[PDB]
Amino acid sequence: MAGPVAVVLGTAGNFVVLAKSGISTTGSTHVTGDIGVSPAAASAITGFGLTMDKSNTFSRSSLVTGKVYAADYHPPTPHNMTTAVSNMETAYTAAAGVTAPAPVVGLGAGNIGGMTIAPGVYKWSTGVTIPTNVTLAGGANDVWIFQIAQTLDISSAQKVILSGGAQAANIFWQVAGQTTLGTTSVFNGTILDLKAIVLNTGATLNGRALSQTAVTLDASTVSAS
């Protein structure tokens, strides 16, 4: 009802971590959902201790509640991963291209720390920083699309707070540079990144990390919403 139309993820929506060049973990990581890489092979998934299913279509990890997929697994996984990664590229470009309603440009000159942000399209030609908690306030069906030309950072122990009914499933962060989630930060939404998504020690992501390069997790928590 308020803000832009929600970004369509297609089968990229079936993953909580999706990458083209790799996924790496160290420490006490815990992922709730499915993860996958393509066109990289399973060797580009590191630190997860993968065990192939007898089908050879997926693997299981002690750090993943769901399934692990990779481009070198048995049919139909290669085709399904090609479709997911194409759907991720489509979503990235769709999100970057949203024009309506009229975007707010350069909010906070890139520093949105301490703000309360209504449903809408927000665009920066700069990077964005979150040095102190930011609140996204709106209803259960309201949408936020963030369009970021450079880096996205949230500082150590800061959060994206949701209020009013705001749901992580309706919050899209389109980022052309690296996204870094600082130590012990709490982040909400689907990250559509052209470059790396890096979760520093003990960071939490409620939503999805959808990278066209690599995702790194350091004792981090990733969970679908």
Q: What does the chain look like in DSSP terms, one character per residue?
A: --SSPPPP-GGGGG-SEEESSEEEEESS-EEES-EEESSS-GGGEESS--EE-TTSS-EE-TTBSS-EEETTSSTTHHHHHHHHHHHHHHHHHHHHH---S-PEESGGGGB-TT-EE-SEEEEESS-EEESS-EEEE--TT--EEEEESS-EEE-TT-BEEEETT--GGGEEEEESS-EEE-TT-EEEEEEEESS-EEE-TT-EEEEEEEESSEEEEES-EEE--
Beta partners for 140?
Answer: none
Omega cis (within 30) before 101: yes
Resolution in A: 1.8
Beta partners for 84?
Answer: none
